[PDB]
Amino acid sequence: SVIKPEMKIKLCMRGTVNGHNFVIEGEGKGNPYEGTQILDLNVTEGAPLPFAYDILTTVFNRAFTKYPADIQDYFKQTFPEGYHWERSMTYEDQGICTATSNISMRGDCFFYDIRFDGVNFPPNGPVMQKKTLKWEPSTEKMYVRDGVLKGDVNMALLLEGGGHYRCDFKTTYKAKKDVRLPDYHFVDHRIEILKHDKDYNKVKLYENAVARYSMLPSQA
Amino acid sequence: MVSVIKPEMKIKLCMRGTVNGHNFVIEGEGKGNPYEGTQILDLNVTEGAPLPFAYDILTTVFNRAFTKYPADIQDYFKQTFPEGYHWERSMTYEDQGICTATSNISMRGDCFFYDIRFDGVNFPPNGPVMQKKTLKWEPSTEKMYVRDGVLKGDVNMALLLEGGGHYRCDFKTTYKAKKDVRLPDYHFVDHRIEILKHDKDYNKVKLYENAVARYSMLPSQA
Amino acid sequence: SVIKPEMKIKLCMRGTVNGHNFVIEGEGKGNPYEGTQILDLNVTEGAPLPFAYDILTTVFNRAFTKYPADIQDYFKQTFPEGYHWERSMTYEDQGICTATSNISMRGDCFFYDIRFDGVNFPPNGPVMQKKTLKWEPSTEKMYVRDGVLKGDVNMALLLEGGGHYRCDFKTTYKAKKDVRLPDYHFVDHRIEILKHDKDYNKVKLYENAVARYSMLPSQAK
Amino acid sequence: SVIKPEMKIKLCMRGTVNGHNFVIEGEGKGNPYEGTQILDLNVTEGAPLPFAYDILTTVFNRAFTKYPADIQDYFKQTFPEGYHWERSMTYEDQGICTATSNISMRGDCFFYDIRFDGVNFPPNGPVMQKKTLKWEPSTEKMYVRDGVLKGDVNMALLLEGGGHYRCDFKTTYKAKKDVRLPDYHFVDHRIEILKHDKDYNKVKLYENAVARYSMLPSQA
User: Fold this and answer.
1) I need a labelling partner for C218 at 20 to 30 A (CA). Which of A18, A64, B147, C74 fits?
2) Do the Cβ atoms of D121 and D165 come closer than 8 Å?
3) Is the peptide bond preceding residue A48 cis, with omega within 30 degrees of 0?
4) By CA distance, what is C208's nearest residue in D?
5) Which residues neighbour C178 within 8 Å (Cβ) at sequence distance 6 or greater?
C-alpha cells in the first residue's frame, strides 16, 4: 500500500467568513490505520480571526480512520490518485458554511488544497462572539449515493455558558478513480484542540476516527 | 432501588394520523424490557386500511423508557414515571416530505399507554414513501442534549430502498418530562428498529426495537 | 358556476401545538372572484391557547383568490368536488407546523375539515411567548409539480418591540378532478386579524389574495 | 449623490463548484434608478464550465433597483463607501451554494470582488446536466435584522421538460456606514440571459429589479 503506517500532512486553507478573508497553513502527521492525527495550524493572513475557530477544525481527511477489515475503506483505496470532498455545514441559527478540499499525495505526505466559506452568521451568535468550547464527539453516517460516498453528521458545539449549538454536516467524498464502494456504516469521531494561543493564530489539533457497523444484533 | 418501571412492562397505544390526506387509526399492544432496551409491539390498522404509503415512516413513532442506560448517564425517561412525559418530533425527508408527531406517554400498573398523533405532508406521488419502495430503516445513532430544561434528541435516519440506495430523513425530537428529573450530559442512543413480520398490506405488523445509551467510545486527549 | 359571487364558509380545526390540544370552529363569508373573505373564529376546546394565534391564521382556501382571465384558476375549477391541501410551516428557530385541510362545498357554503400540529417551539420564543403582531403581506410562488399545484411562500411575523420572525411555507394543493393546470405565477396576500378578545377565544379574520404574473416585462432578444 | 443615472460595472468572480475551479470577469453598465443593467461575462479560467450557468447569474448588486420615494433605499445610501453581501442558495436536491460579494465604487463605476462556491450537487441532477432554461421572475422579501438588511427569495429554475427546480435564497446585505433602514418591503426581479455562446464562456446578462410595498390595502 502507498498509505504508510505514518503519513505527513501539509495543507493550505483560503477562506472568507462574515466577509473576512483569511489564510491558514498547516502541517502535521498521523497514523492512518490507527485513525489518529495531529496538525499544527498557523494563521498567515487575516489574523486575528473574528469568529470561532471551531467552525474550521473539521475541515482541517478520512484516510485517517481506523477501518475494520469487514468494512470497505473508500478512502485509502483512492490513493495515490487521491480524492476531493465537498461539505455543507448548516447551523441552527442559519449560518451556513461550505468547504471543498482536494487531497493529493507525494511520497509519505498528503497535501490538502482547501476552500472555506461562511455566510449569514448572526452578529451576536456564538460563532461571531466566540462562545464555543469544543465540538462534542460524533457519529457520522456513511452511505453510497450515485456512485460516490456521502457522510452526514449531526454536530454540536458545547457553549461557554452551557448548552449546545447545533450544526448539520452533509459531505460528499469523491474518489479520483474507480474503487469498491462500502456498505452503510458509521464513523465515530472525537476532534479536539489540544493547544491554542490567545487569538488562535497557532493551534494544535487532534482527531480520532474509527469506523464500525452497528453492534446491535439484528433480529430479522 | 425499587422502581415503578418493572423489568418487564406492557404497552398499549393508539395512533391517529393523516398522511397525504389519508386518515387512519392504528392500535398496538406489546411488551418489553426497559432496562435491556428491547421491546416488541403488535400493531393493527383499524381505520384507513390498507395504508397507501410506506409503513416504515410510522415505526419510530410507535418510547425511550425502553433504552438500556448505563449507570453513569442520567436516564431522563425512567425518572419521569409514573407521571410520564410527552414528546414532539419533526421528521424532514430529503424530498421535502415532512412528518410531525406528538406522543403522550402515561403508565398504570405494569403498562405504558401512548396517545399518538401522526401527520405527513407533501410526499411526492412517485417517491418511495407513496410508492412503498422502502425496505427498512438502518440502525442509527441519536444525539441527546439538554436545552431549556428538557431533553432534545436529533438523529440522521436512512431508509434502505428497493433496488438499492438510501432515502434520508432528519429527525428532531423534544422529550418533555411531566415532573422534575435529573438531566443527563450530552450522550448517544444507538438504535436498531426492525419489522419482524407483516401481512401483505401491513395491516398487521410485528415491530422490534433495541436501543442502548452510551458516551463516545473514544478517549479524550485534552 | 357552482362558485357564486358570495360564498359562506364553515370550518372545524382540531390541533395540537407544544402538546396542547385545542379545537376551533369558524363561520364566515367572502367573495371568491374578488379574492376577499371574513371569518369569525371561536375556540371551543383548549382555551386559553398558550401560543401565538397568528400561527393558525393562514390555515383558516385559495378559491378566495382574484384570478385574471389569463391565468388558469386551479381552485375554482375543482368545484363542486373540491380539493384538499397539505402544508409545512418551518420557522427559523426550527419550530415546525403541519396542516391538512379538506375543502368541500354544499350549496353556497364551503366546508373545511382541518388538522393542525406544531412541534418543537422553543419555550422562550415568540410563538410560546405570544410576541407576534401580524403576518406581513406576502407573495406566494405557484408552480405545477407532478400534476398538482405547489405554492411556496416566505412568511414573516412582525414582532412586538420590532423585527421579524421568519417561516417558510410549502403547500401542495390537490384537486379531486382533472382541471386545466396554470403556468408559473404569483399570489399576493394580505391576511389580517380585524378583532380579537383578550385571549383570542374570539377572532375576526380577513384575507385579500390576488393572482398575477410578474409585473416586469421580458427583454427582447 | 455619487450614484449617477448611468453607472459602469467591473467584476471578478472566483469560484469552485463540484470541485471545479473557475474565474469569470465581467463588465457592463446599468441605470440604478431604473433598476436595470446589462453585463457581459467572460470565463477566463476553468472553461468550459461543467454546470448550469444559471446558478451563477444572481451573484453577478441591489444598487440597481428602482426604489420609490417612500421606501428607504439601503443600497444607494451606502455609497461611496459601499457594502458587501453574503448569500446561501439551498436547492431542493440539497446542492448548496454560497457567495460573498464586496461592492466598491470609483467615479461612475462599481467594482465587485466575488467568491462563489457550490457543493453536493447530484451528478445526474439539472445543475450538473445543464438542464436549466432560466430563472423565473421573483419577489424577494426585504427585512431588517440586527441593524443590517436581509433579503429572502423563493427562486425557481424552469427546466428542459417544463417543470421547475426550486432554490431558497437567504442574503444579508451589509452597509459600510450608517444608513436609514427601510421598513419591510419587496423587490420584484426578472433576470435573463440575453445571449450566450455554446459553452457559456461568453454570456450577456440583464436584470430588472423594482422595490415596492404590497399593493393590497390594509383593512385593519
Assistant:
1) C74
2) no
3) yes
4) D216
5) none
List chain A residues with CB under 8 Å of D118: 98
CATH number assigned to the domain comprising residue D195: 2.40.155.10
Between CA B133 and CA C44 the distance in angstroms is 42
The answer to whether residue D154 neighbours chain B at the CB level (below 8 Å) is: no
- Cα B208 to Cα A185, B30, B41: the distances in Å are 21, 10, 7
Q: Is D166 near chain C, with CB under 8 Å?
A: yes
**A19 Cα to chain B: minimum distance (Å):** 30
* Chain D closest-CA separation from residue A201 CA (Å): 24
B1 belongs to a structural domain: no
The amino acid at D207 = E
On whether any CB of chain D is under 8 Å from the CB of A86, the answer is: yes
Cβ-nearest to C139 among D163, D166, D186: D186
Residue ranges with strand state E in chain A: 7-17, 20-31, 36-45, 83-91, 96-106, 109-119, 132-135, 138-145, 148-159, 164-175, 185-196, 202-212
Exposed e or buried b per residue across D172-210, where buried means at least 16 C-beta atoms within 10 angstroms of its C-beta: bbbbeeebeebebbbbbbbbbbeeeeeebbebbbbbbbb
Specify if C2 maps to a domain: no
Question: Which residues are CB-contacts of C198 (< 8 A; sequence separation ≥ 6)?
Answer: none
Cell of C208: 385579500
Q: Which residue has the cell 469523491?
A: A174
Q: A1: how many CB neighbours lie within 10 A of its CB? A: 10
Close Cβ partners of A210 (under 8 Å, ≥ 6 residues apart): A35, A65, A66, A187, A188, B217, B218
Q: How many domains does chain C have?
A: 1
Backbone CA torsion sign across C218, C208, C191, D69 = positive
Q: Does C171 touch chain D (CB under 8 A)?
A: no
Measured between alpha carbons, how far is D209 from D135 in angstroms, rounded to an integer?
Answer: 14
For this entry, resolution in Å reads: 1.6
Residues 6+ apart with CB under 8 A from A39: A9, A11, A26, A27, A28, A60, A204, A205, A206
Structure-block grid coordinates of residue A176 = 479520483
Instruction: Tell me whether C185 touches chain D (CB under 8 Å).
Output: no
Q: Which chain B residue has the Cα nearest residue A220?
A: B196
Question: Closest to D206 (Cβ–Cβ): which among C137, C153, C219?
Answer: C219
Decide: helix, strand or coil at residue D75: helix
Contacts of D182 (CB under 8 A, 6+ apart): D71, D72, D73, D74, D142, D144, D149
Residue D220 lies in a domain: no
- Pairing type for strands C109-119 and C7-17 reads parallel
* Phi, psi angles (nearest 5°) of residue C158: -70, 135
Q: Could you give the dihedral angle defined by the CA atoms of residues C31, C36, C40 and C46, in that order, rounded to the nearest 10 degrees?
A: 120
Q: Which three cell numbers stand for residue A193?
A: 484542540
Report which DSSP code applies to D80. T
**Rounded Cα distance, D167 and D93, in Å:** 9
Note whether B174 and B151 are within 8 A (CB).
yes
Q: Which of A141, A154, A213 sits opposite B154 (nearest CB)?
A: A154
State how far residue B143 is from chain A, nearest Cα, in angstroms: 7
From chain C, pick out residues whose CB is under 8 angstroms from the CB of B122.
86-88, 170-172
Q: Grid coordinates in use for A180?
A: 469498491
- Residues of chain A positioned with their CB less than 8 A from the CB of B140: 141
**B touches which chains (3+ CB pairs under 8 A)?**
A, C, D
Q: What domain range is B187 assigned to? A: 9-214
Rounded CA-CA distance D29/D92 in Å is 33
Q: How far is CA A117 from CA A46, A100, A101, B130, in A?
A: 14, 9, 12, 38
Q: Are C155 and C168 in contact (CB under 8 A)?
A: yes
Q: Which residue is listed with cell 434520508?
A: B168
Question: In chain B, which residue ranges form alpha helices assigned H by DSSP?
Answer: 56-59, 76-79
Q: How far is D75 from D53, CA to CA, in rounded Å?
A: 26
| Cβ(D211)–Cβ(D63) below 8 Å | no
